[PDB]
Design a protein around this ligand. Structure first.
Ligand SMILES: Cc1cn([C@H]2C[C@H](O)[C@@H](COP(=O)(O)OP(=O)(O)OP(=O)(O)O)O2)c(=O)[nH]c1=O
Ligand SMILES: Cc1cn([C@H]2C[C@H](O)[C@@H](COP(=O)(O)OP(=O)(O)OP(=O)(O)O)O2)c(=O)[nH]c1=O
Ligand SMILES: Cc1cn([C@H]2C[C@H](O)[C@@H](COP(=O)(O)OP(=O)(O)OP(=O)(O)O)O2)c(=O)[nH]c1=O
Ligand SMILES: Cc1cn([C@H]2C[C@H](O)[C@@H](COP(=O)(O)OP(=O)(O)OP(=O)(O)O)O2)c(=O)[nH]c1=O
Ligand SMILES: [Mg+2]
Ligand SMILES: [Mg+2]
Ligand SMILES: [Mg+2]
Ligand SMILES: [Mg+2]
Ligand SMILES: [Zn+2]
Ligand SMILES: [Zn+2]
Ligand SMILES: [Zn+2]
Ligand SMILES: [Zn+2]
Lengths: 160, 160, 162, 160
């Protein structure tokens, strides 16, 4: 009985922490677990493509993926692992700094048995934040960074 | 202080009921409300394009949209209404009978402050259902119908 | 495989609507369902009862039981626990707090027995932010006073104490 | 604008982890935070009574409380702090090993703006667990321990 669970939200909403909470629940109950992280975010197997890690994932019952937006093969991997009877849990940004779909990640939603969107605190007005604002002027989608380069932000502060 | 809330799920998960629950909360507190329904679902203003109802929506504080996947202008409408300070609540299928994104509806996710995926009961094995199976052989995406044409289904029953 | 699900929240949060949404999911899938309402709440908008024991026999022939306004049944705990242990799905909509923000009857005893517990939210009728509580408008002091928005406001913390 | 949030669940459901997730959200946004833990669970200020820690809590905007069931003054403390404009977040067991209310903790529910009940994995059948079973024969409520002394369990496994 396989499954895909998706944890969405802006930056600073605790997506990775929620991923680990969910994974630890199975681990403490003696399930074999594997967590995959995107190798280029360096601020628990590192990977750039999920296929590079698929043999390790096959010998496990529960798979966690952190920063799923950066994996070009996120959809085919999760779907194949869930159909092989694995529980797959994915933490990911739903939107880029432009509030557009981040990579292929939203194609998981129609495939998922569970989808949640977490919330952050607006770093500018301190209300609830749904979005991520880029502070600099860089235009490319992939720019690795933390609170130095990004603010979690509400709708009003996003457009300010 | 505008916002977009999205209620996703397969068929038979009570998306419309949850939309009404949320809308009634505001209405009981004296907010002016408008509910829009897709005119072609024959099975509360009917509409085929949201632009056709934009004038009525402008004089209201809370807008509910049922079956949002069928409006080709869902994204621009919701984003415009939320930026104009309105609370927009959207009930929508996330997936077609093929478990692919239904129209443009997933582009709302990165723009929404709240996203939830509801669950149905599998009509074939009676466990939790996340998907919709088409019973017949028709291949086009838009085919209006209820439990006579569709089953809410789990992963296993979907592929049976 | 029985179950207790609990839907909490202040007044005007849509607890009854969420109850019905959950019950209809099972019904549309061919499960036999029963909904029980508190007989003394005769407000405009499904078996009426004052004690859940009085409808136990009907409940035994069904797979899914919904209970509206569970706070008013003195036998809520033993009924739900017995039905869930007999393999039924029991769904309970109830106020968690009185107008005094105190536990409403025996209803919180269900929480340690329940596999699912949610607390819904209302809109503050005085400042229009999120409301978690119910304020009584009049001066009556007894717990049980039936009424709607004529007698009660859903209210935030600050408006509750105003 | 003060607030009480309550995180309930059986053992091994990640209540502490969810508490920290929520606290870190505020901290990363520059709020002053304090976390209080029950001093007698020695498996972040330790305390036996919340009143012993009330002066520290007054100089802070966000207060987290771990294992709230063990503080006899949980209700008056949280209510007082929330009315003073603080955000109070409480992780706690809802039920003892006998599935009875654990201390005074349920009296927080009618005072709280947010209440959630987390789930664990059944350590005996591996389905969803809502309860905690004591493995030994000791009869007193307070017995500190982990997976050595307790299993998270479903309804059926609880009564087996
Ligand atoms: C918004 C955005 C982020 N990023 C990068 C910045 C970060 O390195 C990474 C975000 O990782 P996350 O793990 O999503 O960021 P986080 O740790 O703040 O979130 P959480 O607390 O929820 O775990 O993605 C982009 O490259 N492009 C973008 O448009
Ligand atoms: C799955 C699927 C449904 N449909 C149609 C069938 C229905 O008429 C409509 C589904 O609308 P819904 O409002 O999703 O159906 P519902 O009433 O069961 O929903 P709920 O109980 O959650 O309120 O879309 C398609 O046209 N194509 C598809 O691929
Ligand atoms: C708060 C409170 C309510 N009541 C009564 C008033 C109502 O008759 C009943 C509350 O029923 P509800 O069904 O909780 O109220 P509702 O129908 O407005 O809420 P929802 O939208 O969530 O369904 O209890 C008391 O008798 N004493 C009290 O202290
Ligand atoms: C069920 C139960 C637990 N305990 C004790 C045992 C532990 O020391 C403590 C457990 O509190 P928790 O913090 O709930 O234990 P946990 O670490 O499993 O929690 P989580 O993973 O959700 O963060 O309570 C009792 O004393 N009596 C009881 O009846
Ligand atoms: Mg991260
Ligand atoms: Mg519908
Ligand atoms: Mg009601
Ligand atoms: Mg703990
Ligand atoms: Zn802001
Ligand atoms: Zn099935
Ligand atoms: Zn208010
Ligand atoms: Zn079990």
């Amino acid at each position: 009985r396989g499954q895909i669970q998706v944890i969405l939200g802006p930056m600073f909403s605790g997506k990775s922490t929620e991923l680990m909470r969910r994974v630890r629940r199975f681990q403490i109950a003696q399930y074999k677990c594997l967590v995959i992280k995107y190798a280029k975010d360096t601020r628990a197997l590192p990977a750039c493509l999920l296929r590079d890690v698929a043999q390790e994932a096959l010998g496990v019952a529960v798979i966690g993926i952190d920063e799923g937006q950066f994996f070009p093969d996120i959809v085919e991997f999760c779907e194949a692992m869930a159909n092989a009877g694995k529980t797959v849990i994915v933490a990911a940004l739903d939107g880029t700094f432009q509030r557009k779909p981040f990579g292929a990640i939203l194609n998981l939603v129609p495939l998922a048995e569970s989808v949640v969107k977490l919330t952050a605190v607006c770093m500018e007005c301190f209300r609830e934040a749904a979005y991520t604002k880029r502070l600099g002027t860089e235009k490319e989608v992939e720019v690795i960074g933390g609170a130095d380069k990004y603010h979690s932000v509400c709708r009003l502060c996003y457009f300010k």
